[PDB]
Design a protein around this nucleic acid. Sequence first.
RNA 1: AAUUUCUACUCUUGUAGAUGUGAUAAGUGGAAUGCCAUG
DNA 2: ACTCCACATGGCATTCCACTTATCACTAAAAGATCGGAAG
DNA 3: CTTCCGATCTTTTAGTGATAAGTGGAATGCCATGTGGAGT
Length: 1240
Amino acid sequence: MTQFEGFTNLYQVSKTLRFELIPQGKTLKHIQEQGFIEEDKARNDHYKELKPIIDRIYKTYADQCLQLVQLDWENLSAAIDSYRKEKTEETRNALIEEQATYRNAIHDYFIGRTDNLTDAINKRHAEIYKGLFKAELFNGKVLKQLGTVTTTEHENALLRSFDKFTTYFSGFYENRKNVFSAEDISTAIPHRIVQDNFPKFKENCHIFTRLITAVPSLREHFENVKKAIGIFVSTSIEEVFSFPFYNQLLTQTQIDLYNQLLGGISREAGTEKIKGLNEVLNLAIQKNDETAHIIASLPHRFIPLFKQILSDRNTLSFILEEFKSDEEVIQSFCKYKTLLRNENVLETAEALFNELNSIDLTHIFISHKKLETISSALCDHWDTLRNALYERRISELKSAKEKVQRSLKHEDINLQEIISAAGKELSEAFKQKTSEILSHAHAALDQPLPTTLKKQEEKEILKSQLDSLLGLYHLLDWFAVDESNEVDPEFSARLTGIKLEMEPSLSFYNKARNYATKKPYSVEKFKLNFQMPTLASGWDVNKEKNNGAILFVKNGLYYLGIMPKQKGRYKALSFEPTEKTSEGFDKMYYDYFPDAAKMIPKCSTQLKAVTAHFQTHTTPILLSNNFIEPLEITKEIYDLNNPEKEPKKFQTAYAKKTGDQKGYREALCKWIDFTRDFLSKYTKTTSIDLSSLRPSSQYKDLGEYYAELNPLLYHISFQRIAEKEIMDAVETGKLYLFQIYNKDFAKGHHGKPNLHTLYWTGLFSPENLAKTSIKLNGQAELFYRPKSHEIIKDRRFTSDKFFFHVPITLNYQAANSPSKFNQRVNAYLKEHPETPIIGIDRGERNLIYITVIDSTGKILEQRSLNTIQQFDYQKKLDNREKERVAARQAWSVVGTIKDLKQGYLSQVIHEIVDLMIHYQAVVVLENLNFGFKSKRTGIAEKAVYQQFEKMLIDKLNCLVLKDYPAEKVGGVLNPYQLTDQFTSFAKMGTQSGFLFYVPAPYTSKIDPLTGFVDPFVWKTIKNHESRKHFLEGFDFLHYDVKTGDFILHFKMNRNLSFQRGLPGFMPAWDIVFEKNETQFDAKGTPFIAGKRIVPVIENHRFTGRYRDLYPANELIALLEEKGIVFRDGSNILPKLLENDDSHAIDTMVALIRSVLQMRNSNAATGEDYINSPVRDLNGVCFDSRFQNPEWPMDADANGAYHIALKGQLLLNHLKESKDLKLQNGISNQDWLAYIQELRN
RNA sequence: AAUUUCUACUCUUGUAGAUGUGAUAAGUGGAAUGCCAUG
DNA sequence: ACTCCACATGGCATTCCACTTATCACTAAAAGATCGGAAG
DNA sequence: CTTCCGATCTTTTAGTGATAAGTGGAATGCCATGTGGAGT
Ligand SMILES: [Mg+2]
Ligand SMILES: [Mg+2]
């Protein structure tokens, strides 16, 4: 009988606690006068300068390695094709093996162990790779093998400024070893080549060959654009899109050339662009030819490749010049404005714009491409000018319409024909517009310039002037000056003169926009090192004089002590432990042996002495260094750890590959005995009570043995020190004493502590000291942030503050990773039938909506989480989102919205977790594609689709409730672990512990009472005869004489060509045009039943705004206008389709589409209800405006309710699942059939 | 209207909830401006 | 107190911003470089 | 006047089994369409 309290101590999690350090006593004088802060600031600055200098070596080596790659890519393409054909486990394993094989084949060039290279080149690559992650980068032991980097004297000084400090780059070495490795890291060069870029290139090749097979002219078009751009002159376009061409496109230059082939080289702005592959395909589609209809079915976009991991991008496009400071942009703009003033732009522009009143307008022309701008700016709509032109061309006349459209689409038009088509109103609006634009330009030129671009007003005035100048340039670009059509000579010459004068303003606008929108400078913290190469990397007492980090405890206040280097040497400061009743500090005594898996072979088998001993003779060697008794290394022990092959004989890989269970068991037992002897004999571990360990032959696998052994090697004890010694040490300057501090260590605190304060207090509590459940970690780091009753706004930023980031580890007694975590949760849900569901719907109108259901589908609690603790967070997020949108267009400080969303979700996660604990339920979420949620966050960044799964999963991974006692599960020492260990979103399955993912579709627009959905898809009824065929497919519809509602019948075996392909459980439906009378809810508000909300499509091409519709009222109005009698209750459908008028059939289809729309939304009045087009067997049509608590209230509440029921389906199928596994997704047919069978 | 830091506050020199840091790399999405086209 | 109206989209290019996603470390001790004093 | 070497400070190192990712596509929906401005 498993229990809900059993979900604890399953896996380790690592957390970082952050505290402010208060300098205690005279330590601030000693840390300031020795210049540690300034030296560490200079060290950080030199590191930031030196990082790209070092990166040049890695980029050069990666280039020189990747130009030598010569592989055959047919096997990987075949593997991907076979995986895409059928998604099964065996083909997935084959694809994983092939990807690993190619990732190793790429990695062999970096190592220098490939057959297809010479021995000298391989030796050079091996000797380059050997010193690539060491101090050989600094002292030139590997730089002279390359030579191409060509470091100058300042770069050499920067490189040698880190003398005896190379281990500062240790984390950089770990970061850069991920790149040159083939261990399936996403941030690796071979993984990027094999798994990221190659599927994109294969899809591009398949797209190209399909496109060429469909139409032959696109081959000539692609050859012409490839010749015109100027890339790959030796390879044809049939050879570029081929598998052997992927031996290139590995270095960044070839990738950028391929991307410029796809996208197109761009010249300077104001000059015609050379099109790309995607651009010319979009141009061919937009022509609306028959070939466009051919292409539209095909997938018509080539996918560009990704950047290489280190090499920077370069392009053939016009990289436009940038300014460097506010002084330069103001001085350059003042010079440009002065130049425009003495050249006298404005009087000759006004002469041009008043010359139209006394000139023959037949010798002037308007550019064809910009007539839409004039139409939008001058008249009520963009279509008015071209509609007038079309009517005028008709008035002076099948094929003639095409001739008129072809004349209007590409040939310039004179202004006299414009003035004949439109009349006096366009003339007066035109001169008014030029007068307004010239007035704006004159006002901009007379207005002085601000000095600096610091505050918003000084940037807004600059934008106001420069946009007016751009508007005058746009107005001046209206006229056509080219010789292809007739034009007055002197006017054209002077017009191109003033346009040539005005040309650089458009580039000036872009330069000022690129400068003015930069992020403002803000002071940031930097890592302190106290002139120590390895400061605070470990708390151990053996390393306490080299690391310097020692913790203390003083009557509940926690202190940190740093002993600096004295005259450049490590003075081993020692403390004498005294009697416990003496007043003073309690020193923390750390005892650790970091990991048995890495430290048993290092201190036993991988010594230089042992390896040198075993390459001449097989006699066992006795080791005496750091051993109380001489330990013996035998021959078979050394060959167990060095088997001259990748799998070792005592590990699970050998047993899986070979199957020799007996040999694996013998090797494992020998290794356990050897580790026991080693831990018995080593001085560091000779006092460890190893009697609690199991015998050697009982362990199933070595990882279990290490997971059991590791908690025994960690220990903390506290020793008393006299206060006089510590005070003398901190006064003399031999010790820097800081107090670990936050809000909860203040004088007057009353309430419950912070969660991290609970972690810190529970780490050093006596019960955790007796048995370690929370582990204090190394690699602590110190940061210094400078300067950026008496209650003061932003008091914390008024002075410099020392920070202290310290990692901790929770659930230390557990394993590193859980052992089949989902099996335990599935077993617990299998043995517990009555388990609720806390299903969640995410959106933007309602940010989070939840519904809690029981096992029988009833509603326990439904509630919108737009407001928590009397704060409507959705309105605040909407205001912030609108402020950011309006601020990024006025060149303001955009700011951050992540903080407010995190604040809102901190409340939401607490409410959801509180319901989880109080109901002992599961949480079902909707499985949304990353593209969809990124698109919806792009449209409105108020939304919380992302940043909600991550916080919920990370909270449930280590859930500590503040109220609960520490010894009880759920306390600070026994956290709840209700989710699987979070590694990455890609590797997450459909179930993560108690959190469930169900498919998204058919959860909102579904009737909760009977499970009806709209069966049609409205894209297939675009034409009138299809509307006739859709109309004759229905059985009947007639007016009920006693209830006043039209009852339309449906049989599901009809209109299969218009259905979306989901036959429901029911064979028939009763679609009802309900009587539009007044109904009252529980609160007494009136509403009209059957009301629908539909956007207006009166223009037949655009989506207008919403309007209220009444299907019964408009239906009876249509039928009374037609005069068709219906009071006898007879079927009207054959009486209706007997006429050939398109208006009646069109409004019939419109009414049917409107009545079948379940979701009715109107953001202006705040209405999100659902009305049901069909009738329940109880004789009540559903309407959520009744607001009965047994049924959902809004549409998002309905969405949450059907997320809950979709997870109810999974839990219902779990009870009959003998394999303790869930379904492999839920098909929409299965879900609809299940819900419609449950309702009926 | 105080906070390691974020969010909502002020019976309380503080309250309630949350908070994995550092480093590196990549991608996505907005906005402005150009070019070719579409309604 | 009513009613009309606000140009929109597709493919690329440049710059700027914000935000997300995916790896590594959470480390004592063995090995190697350096140096001040002893010995020749 | 020159050479060695034991102390001491940086620097590099050692490396387990999680076994996962369970598939089901063939297309849908998953959510919403600027909401706010003006004259008369
Ligand atoms: Mg939903
Ligand atoms: Mg929803």
